[PDB]
Design a protein around this ligand. Structure first.
Ligand SMILES: COc1ccc(C#Cc2cc(-c3nn(CCCN4CCOCC4)c4c3CN(S(C)(=O)=O)CC4)ccc2Cl)cc1CNCc1ccccc1
Length: 223
């Protein structure tokens, strides 16, 4: 069965909120955030992974442009191709494009595969968040109400299903009935509720939250 509510922070699978600054690298944070949860699920260690590693190294082969945007799916493919990603501690974030400085000596996680979920299916997103872990998603976050969000369940009538900002679904629930997705942003802890925003759930793929979801996996052998 599916829990009525999920918050992956309760199980210690979510690192501290990061602050991307003036580097359009939300895709990098969304991808590492999803992989961090799998690293903890599979090994028990919660380590921040290096978004800067993706910004510098997951580039033109993966359709990504560093501080000018990119994609969580191909970020995961780089980690598969590279056979690792560095910890954030060892490859820290500078909010600018750099030369690739990946060092395998400090590799903290790998990725075996990733799964893309079907467009707009909030039921399938719910099941993945419940049974797999946090899911990387894009949202339409260009509207002023997103930038000003403080609390409650976010609903914006002008939102569309075209995504323009990468975030991390770490759970779901309802606020006094009002169904929401628990969303980790990368605008530091002063955005929203200590860096989190609850976004309207089951209201016709609101703000595109279920448009392009994906999550990575770390496989233990096989049968
Ligand atoms: C103009 O600025 C933009 C515009 C777009 C984005 C973005 C994005 C984004 C996009 C996707 C996304 N995957 N796929 C499927 C795969 C596409 N790929 C093809 C080639 O490579 C591999 C994957 C699509 C979209 C977008 N769609 S669509 C228009 O929605 O139909 C078309 C199909 C998945 C995750 C993210 Cl995150 C980011 C910025 C910069 N951020 C600005 C900003 C906005 C608000 C608040 C703060 C900052």
């Amino acid at each position: 069965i599916l829990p009525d509510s999920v918050d992956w922070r309760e199980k210690g699978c979510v690192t501290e909120v990061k602050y991307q600054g003036s580097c359009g690298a939300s895709w990098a944070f969304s991808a590492v955030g999803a992989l961090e949860a799998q690293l903890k699920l599979k090994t028990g260690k919660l380590v921040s992974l290096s978004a800067q590693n993706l910004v510098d190294c997951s580039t033109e082969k993966y359709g990504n442009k560093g501080c000018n945007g990119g994609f969580m799916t191909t970020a995961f493919q780089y980690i598969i191709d590279n056979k690792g990603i560095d910890s954030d501690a060892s490859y820290p974030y500078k909010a600018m494009d750099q030369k690739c400085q990946y060092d395998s000596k400090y590799r903290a996680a790998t990725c075996s595969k990733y799964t893309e979920l079907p467009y707009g299916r909030e039921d399938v997103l719910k099941e993945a968040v419940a049974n797999k872990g946090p899911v990387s998603v894009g949202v339409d976050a260009r509207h002023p109400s997103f930038f000003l969000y403080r609390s409650g369940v976010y609903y914006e009538p002008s939102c569309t299903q075209n995504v323009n900002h990468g975030v991390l679904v770490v759970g779901y629930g309802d606020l006094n009935g009002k169904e929401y997705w628990l969303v980790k942003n990368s605008w530091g802890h002063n955005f929203g509720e200590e860096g989190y925003i609850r976004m309207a759930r089951n209201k016709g793929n609101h703000c595109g939250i279920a448009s392009f979801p994906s999550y990575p996996e770390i496989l233990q052998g096989g049968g």
